[PDB]
Each structure stands twice: as structure tokens, then as C-alpha cells.
Structure 1
């Protein structure tokens, strides 16, 4: 049975009054340094610092030059040469912006997606590898050190509709993506082809060659299934070698490609079987665009619902029914919680809402 308990210590509302779609704590900050998180919504990116007695301190507010931009996602990284933190943001315009979080200057941007970007993810070992997932049906892998487009995951056997989410596994050997076509697709990046494409993106030097960098066009995934959910799949994360994914059926499904005993690294691209291992049930979260999250150690799973409830499960409890923690509710938190983020040490859980409100829950 779960023992995790939390207390709501603070809340605030951003003055733009627009829905907040993204929230991320900076997990790159070193131990002892202040806990910082970013929020995204409207044409805004806002940074906050967490302090004692539930204090949420406003640090900087970025306002995009384009008033019609709607940010949907953000992700933290660091400059591998100077150790400086960096923040990537993207949304409806289909443009990735790399912002210096200390000054709020847009350092650089990446154009190429034919439509909106639904999610950004940085590789867990290499801070220069940025993955973007888009309404154009494709995923794109970028090397932000050399400003190159490494690979485009899409085409013949890629997604047939908007890609809503994606996740790298813990060691960054593979990606699972999902979207509106009801499918979950695996893309290995530790293949000889992709490891060489990544190495080539590092050798690319414009002041040494006049030819443009050639991106890989990966048309075929390493696994594909439409047998987990019967509707859009708007969130996917790895849980070790297993997968967590959700649709609108008020359940997060824990599953794995192949039969029960099949090794993730030995499944063939034509594998037609899937194994469901369990379901984390909840209520009132049957609307699209509702993200679940986990803490760094993958000991807690969190998901907000359409009426302001925040569900939490203890992932160290094998049966998902006994894994359920006490649901986090506040009588004033009544709008849809689009995304949550735990601090690196799991001591703080932040939730962001459709009414521009931010809620801080501290672990007891």
C-alpha cells in the first residue's frame, strides 16, 4: 500500500488568464541549488523558484514577439561546454526556440516542422539531442550544438496523424511515440545507422564545407501497435522496459511489446503481439491533451483530471489498485490540470491549469 502524502502549500494565477499546457522543473540544477520550474502557455514562458513555507518566487517572464504563438511544451537542457542551463520551447507555430533562462533572450530557433509541435524531449545522456513531435505526423531529432537536423522519423510506416507525445528510455537507446492514429511506435536510436547519423551530425562543420547536412529519413519503426487503446494516445512514457500510455478511457495502461517473456531488445519490427500488464484507473479525464508524469526515480506517477483533482500512484506497489495514493484535492482548484512536474528530489509536485493557475504540493 502507498504511504506518500502531500500538502497544498501555495497557488497563484498568471495574469494572462490563458491555459497553461506545460510545466517542468529543471532537473539539471545541482544539489543544494534552488528548485526552479518553467511554465508555458499562450505566447508566454515563465520561470519560478521554490522557497520555504510554500513560497513561489517569480524569476523571469518571456513574451514571444509573435502574439499569435501558443506554446504547448518546454524542456530543459544545458550547454555542454559552459554548463549554462538552457530551455527549449515550442507550440502552434511549429518553431523550436532555445532560450537563455538567465536573460530570456532567444539564442536560436529551428524551423522545419510543417505544423505545431506537441512535445519536446532532450536525450538523457547527450544534452544536445533534442526530439520534437509534431502535428505534421513526424518526430525530428536535432543536434543543437551543430544546428543540424539529424533524422526525421516518419513516412511509409510512420504515424498517419498528429503525433502527441514521445519519450526516450532511461539510457537513451530508443524512443516510443504515440498519436491521433491510435498507434504507439518504437524507434531505436542505438542502431548502427542512427549512431552513425548522430556522429556525422557532430562532424558537420559549415565553415569547412559548403554542402548542407543530409538528415536521415527513417520511414520504418522498430515496433508498432494499434492494440492498446481504441482512440488517440496523448501521453507515453517508458517504465524501465515496459510502457505507460493513455487515451480517453480513464486509465493509464502498462504494457510491453511482444509476449510476456519477450526481451525489448530482441523484439522484431514485425512483432504482432502486445502484453498488457496492468491499468491505473482514475475518473473525469476523458478529454484530449492531459499529460501524466513521473518523478526522477520512477517511484511516483501523477496525473491531473478535468475538474482539478491530482491522482498519484506509488510505482513500487505491484498491483495498480493498491498503488493508489490519497488523491490531491483543493476546493479552489477546479480547472483541468494539463500537466504536473515533480522536483528532482520528489519533495515538490507542481500542477498547472486551464485557468492559468499553478498549484504547489509539498511531500510530507
Structure 2
């Protein structure tokens, strides 16, 4: 067993584009095509204790700060909503993007900054007390996944420009371009220790880069196969294990993929889903995996 809780989560009315664990590990957030975030309990009978309405379009990216009280939600319409998790009312809207917002990310260490990316190309940063766009990094093409580093002083935007592009918050320029992908980069996730960063793209390959000031001049250290991207062209997301040992990239062939970081082999190829798997997440404390896919269902499960 090695946990406290394969039990299924049904109740999503359409696709689930993003699933995230609360960092305390007792509650759960999942959202997608429903314009409707569902808050589950991780243990117990896995009920749906709270619901978040306030998106006029589908929810592209759910995200939790390490505080875990406020939930960040990049939606399809033009907006990124900021919610609270206990009583569940949207404390803020963030309305500066002119197209479909594909991504958001919490700044967890310092001030609460929400770096977002959208289909216009603008990568916009969002302090919640400003109610405005702080800095807009103008990428010429669409960005599908954005994330901070551990320092929250750089933004790491992956998009359809075949390159992962990092922007410095003080230099306000693109510093270097992680080239080596052959299609649109859909999912970026960064470790709890913050040195390494996962990359999913429609070249049906997964990369690990090392976003760190110590530069090895070719940051593509680890290349993973097995993944596939299909005609549906979703935003196939990613996650890291909290011990940093396992990566998980969502795939288009209904199989929950979990690799080993060191071994570079597929540890887990899990069945059960029926559609393209958008986001697959990791529990903070115990080795539990939820997986979100287009089959309107979630699969919790003890990996170890």
C-alpha cells in the first residue's frame, strides 16, 4: 500500500485539462473543459467538497502555491482567476491577456507573482495587489506553458516556437534559448528543489533541462521517449515527484507515463484512461498519482 487511502474520481462534466495536489496533501483540485474547478478530498471516500465557478471558458492550468490557501487558474477565455481553497470564492480576476491564456504559475518563495502566458504571445506577470500587468515579455509566437524558477526571478515560457525561452525579471530580455525540440512545447514543470525543469512537446519526446545559474552550455541533459502527441493537439502537461526521483508527462495514448529520472526508463505505464491525458500530478507526502485526461475522469493511485 504505502499510503493512507486505484479509486476513480467521476464528476467532471467534460475534459480535465489540469490536475494539481494541494501541497499539504489532504485536498485536491481538478479542472478542465467544464469552466468549473472541482475540489476533492485525497483520502477518505474521495468526495467533492467544494466547487469553483467563475470561469467563462475552459480552465487551462490549475496551480497551487506552497502556502496552498490560494489557487491560481489560467482559463481559456482571456483571464486568470485567483481563488481561495477553504470557503472557495474567487478573490481576484487577472484580465490583461488578449487571447487564450494557456498557462499560469505561482511564485512561492517571495511575493505572490503569477507569471502567465497566452496565445497572443505576451508572457505577463501578475502581482495580485497591483490589479495590472507588471511586465509583458513579447514572444512572437504562442506560449503554451510558463513557469517560474525556484528564485521566482526568471520566467520559463515554453511555446510553439520550438524553443524554451527564459526571461529575466531584472534584465527584461530573453537570456538564452533552449533549442532542441521540433514542435510545440506544451508542458513545463519545475522541481521542488528548483534546479531541473521538465519539458513536453509534440516531437513526442520529453526533456529535462537544468535551469540554474551554473551553466553547462547545453542544458538538454536527459531525453525521454515513449510519449506521443496526436491529432487532438492538447496541452500535454508535466509534473515532478516531490523527492525529484520521478517525472510524469501526460501523453496522447491514454497511458499515464511515469519515468525514473536517473534510470531514464518508463517506470509506470498505467492504463484506465480512455482519452488523451492532459496533466498527471504527484502527491506531496505519499507516493500517490492522480491523472487528468479527456475521458472526464481522474485516476488516483498508489504508485509505490
Query: 1:269-280 counterparts in 2 under 5 A?
Result: 273-280=172-179
Higher relative contact order (CA 8 A, sep 6+): 1
- Rounded to whole Å, the distance in 2 between the matches of 1:323 and 1:225 is 24
- Rounded to whole Å, the distance in 1 between the matches of 2:194 and 2:146 is 14
1:340, distance to aligned residue in structure 2 (A) = 2.6
Aligned to 1:165: 103
Say whether 1:321 aligns with 2:238.
Answer: no
- Rounded to whole Å, the distance in 2 between the matches of 1:326 and 1:98 is 34
**TM-score, normalization by structure 1:** 0.63
1:297, distance to aligned residue in structure 2 (A) = 1.0
Given that residues 279 and 320 in structure 1 are in contact (C-alpha distance below 8 angstroms), is that contact kept between their aligned partners in structure 2? Answer: no
Q: Assess, with a 3 A threshold, how the Cα gap between structure 1 residues 100 and 326 changes in structure 2: closer, same or farther.
A: closer
Aligned to 1:215: none
**TM-score, normalization by structure 2:** 0.74
Say whether 1:355 aligns with 2:253.
Answer: yes
**Other structure's SS at 1:145 match:** coil
Q: Assess, with a 3 A threshold, how the Cα gap between structure 1 residues 95 and 322 changes in structure 2: closer, same or farther.
A: closer
- Rounded to whole Å, the distance in 2 between the matches of 1:280 and 1:296 is 24
**Other structure's SS at 2:237 match:** strand
| Larger helix share, 1 or 2 | 1
**Number of residue pairs aligned between Structure 1 and Structure 2:** 252
1:306, distance to aligned residue in structure 2 (A) = 2.4
Say whether 1:120 aligns with 2:120.
Answer: no
Query: Cα RMSD between the aligned structures?
Result: 2.6
Aligned to 1:10: none
- Rounded to whole Å, the distance in 1 between the matches of 2:25 and 2:208 is 33
Aligned to 2:121: 182
Given that residues 242 and 254 in structure 1 are in contact (C-alpha distance below 8 angstroms), is that contact kept between their aligned partners in structure 2? Answer: yes
Match of 1:73 among 6, 9, 18: 18
Q: Assess, with a 3 A threshold, how the Cα gap between structure 1 residues 225 and 307 changes in structure 2: closer, same or farther.
A: closer
Given that residues 278 and 320 in structure 1 are in contact (C-alpha distance below 8 angstroms), is that contact kept between their aligned partners in structure 2? Answer: no
Q: Which has the larger radius of gyration?
A: 1
Say whether 1:282 aligns with 2:227.
Answer: no
- Rounded to whole Å, the distance in 2 between the matches of 1:133 and 1:346 is 25
Aligned to 1:143: 84
1:351, distance to aligned residue in structure 2 (A) = 2.5
Query: 1:296-335 counterparts in 2 under 5 A?
Result: 296-316=192-212, 317-329=214-226, 333-335=227-229
